[PDB]
Structure 1
Amino acid sequence: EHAAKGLMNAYENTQASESRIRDADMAEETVAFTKNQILVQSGTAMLAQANVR
Structure 2
Amino acid sequence: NTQANVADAKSRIVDVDFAKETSAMTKYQVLQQTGSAMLAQANQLPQVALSLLG
TM-score normalised per structure 1: 0.74
Counterpart check, 1:33 vs 2:22 = no
Matching residue's letter, 2:43? N
Counterpart check, 1:48 vs 2:4 = no
What is the root-mean-square deviation in Å for CA atoms of aligned residues?
A: 0.9
2:8 aligned to 8, 16, 20, which one?
Answer: 16
Unpaired runs of 5+ in structure 1?
Answer: 1-8
Deviation at residue 13 of structure 1 after TM alignment: 0.5
Moved over 2 A (4+): none
Unpaired runs of 5+ in structure 2?
Answer: 46-54
Number of positions where the alignment pairs a residue of Structure 1 with one of Structure 2: 45
Q: Name the CA distance, whole Å, in 2 between partners of 1:30 and 1:42.
A: 19
- Residue aligned with 1:45, SS: helix
Identity of aligned residues (%): 53
